[PDB]
């Protein structure tokens, strides 16, 4: 949680869902006509990875940012 440096911040968004024996955490990230959309769902895990049965992801956020995305990196602890 150290972070480093950024400038000229354009958009902010906080705690729409506040947080987002185990749970599968599925996300879909898409960028259409300047709107960045995130869809996600949590599925309980009982020790079987990827519990079976159909499960659809509900929309999480819709950000009217206009950012051009060509690459992304996952940030791990």
């Amino acid at each position: 949680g150290v972070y480093s440096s950024a400038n000229n911040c354009t958009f902010e968004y906080v705690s729409q869902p506040f947080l987002m024996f185990k749970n599968l955490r599925e996300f879909v990230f898409k960028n259409i006509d300047g709107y960045f959309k995130i869809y996600s769902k949590h599925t309980p895990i009982i020790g079987r990875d990827f519990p079976q049965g159909f499960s659809a992801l509900e929309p999480l956020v819709d950000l009217p940012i206009g950012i051009n995305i060509t690459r992304f990196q996952t940030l791990l602890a």
């Binding site: 006509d33 300047g34 709107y35 009217p64 940012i65 206009g66």
Partner: protein, 50 residues
């Protein structure tokens, strides 16, 4: 002196004037506009679960 640029840009953006809302009326034939969805009809309480 205050000068307002109102520059506008290609990217989608939501700065907008406030939209006033009237009072709701049910069981009568009315025109309606619900968050940009427009039409004419009779509004009644629904049993549908969204």
């Amino acid at each position: 002196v205050v000068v307002l640029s109102f520059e506008l840009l290609h990217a989608p953006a939501t700065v907008c004037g406030p939209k006033k809302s009237t009072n709701l009326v049910k069981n009568k034939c009315v025109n309606f506009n619900f968050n940009g969805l427009t039409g004419t009809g009779v509004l009644t309480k629904s049993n549908k679960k969204f």
